């Protein structure tokens, strides 16, 4: 002895109360431990709670783990030890938490111009895989009158998919998503765009006394804004004159050359399409090579 003879996996639900039990047999009667897996975090009776939700009772043959407000966080692994003088074991069960589906897209705001496709992603987190649709106003999408929508579902991803975009195609679009806990949205946006978002990430990524490399991230418009080229601009800190350089076309590395060593200079980027030029990327700081 002693010998853990209950250890039940649960399902809640989030916001809902669980109590995990472990029941131990064993002489001299065991003396009964917590520790969630995750963190290594350990309970026992007594031993407060921080944000109140989780407490234990009982120490020796019977413990209760108690969670109220149930967060997902709390999914996951939890262990009990039985412990006598003698005097060991452990078991593992699973907390299985389920929830109405969540959004988890990074974006939900999308921009194009007139005339090009777009994909605009709804991503969803559900316990249990929800079911999820497209619509506009009351309508399922694809509707059966359209020539230029289609969908393509993967688990917890449903790509909405217009190509091209006509003008009605802009507004306010509808991701819902449905499992046995219940029906969630999300809205949309497809916005009507001109010029190109800002680039980002910039960096210098090549050094010397009189030149530079510099690397950034294209603005992603996934597609619906063309950028032409880069308008890169170089400043000395204490002077005036932005000098201007353009890339070469779409690409996203611009050589700088007649710098002088062991100088300090701003450089910012900004896309530029036909219908004009973007905001400026956040400015960046570099100092060339000293002789
Ligand atoms: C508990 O859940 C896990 C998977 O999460 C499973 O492997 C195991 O058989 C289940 N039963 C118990 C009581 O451990
Ligand atoms: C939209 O996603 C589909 C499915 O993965 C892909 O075939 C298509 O090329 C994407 N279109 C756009 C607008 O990038
Ligand atoms: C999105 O669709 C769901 C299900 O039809 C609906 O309940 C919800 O109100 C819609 N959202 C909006 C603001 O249209």
């Given at each position: 002895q002693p010998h853990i003879i209950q250890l039940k996996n649960e399902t809640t639900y989030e916001n809902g109360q669980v109590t995990l039990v472990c029941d131990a047999e064993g002489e001299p009667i065991p003396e009964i431990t917590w520790k969630?897996?995750?963190?290594g975090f350990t309970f026992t009776e007594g031993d407060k709670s921080l944000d109140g939700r989780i407490e234990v009772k009982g120490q020796h043959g019977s413990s209760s783990l108690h969670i109220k407000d149930v967060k997902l966080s709390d999914s996951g692994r939890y262990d009990c030890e039985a412990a006598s003088r003698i005097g060991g074991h452990q078991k593992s069960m699973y907390l299985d938490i389920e929830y109405a589906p969540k959004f988890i897209s990074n974006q939900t705001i999308y921009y194009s111009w007139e005339g090009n496709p777009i994909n605009i992603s709804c991503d969803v987190k559900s316990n249990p895989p929800a079911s999820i649709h497209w619509r506009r106003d009351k309508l399922v999408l694809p509707?059966?009158?359209?020539?230029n929508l289609k969908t393509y579902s993967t688990g917890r991803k449903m790509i909405l998919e217009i190509?091209?975009?006509?003008?009605?195609?802009f507004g306010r679009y509808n991701c819902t998503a449905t499992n046995h806990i219940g029906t969630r949205f999300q809205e949309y946006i497809l916005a009507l765009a001109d010029v190109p978002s800002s680039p980002y990430?910039?960096?210098?990524i090549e050094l010397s006394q009189t030149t530079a490399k510099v690397s950034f991230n294209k603005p992603d418009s996934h597609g619906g804004v063309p950028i032409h080229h880069y308008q890169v601009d170089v400043k000395?800190?204490?002077?005036e004159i932005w000098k201007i350089v353009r890339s070469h076309?779409?690409?996203?590395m611009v050589v700088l050359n007649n710098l002088e060593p062991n100088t300090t200079y701003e450089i910012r980027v900004a896309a530029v399409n036909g219908k004009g030029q973007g905001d400026y990327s956040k400015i960046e700081i570099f100092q060339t090579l000293p002789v």
């Open positions: 969630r897996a995750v963190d509707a059966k009158n359209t020539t190509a091209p975009t006509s003008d009605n195609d990430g910039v960096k210098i000395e800190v204490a002077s076309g779409v690409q996203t």
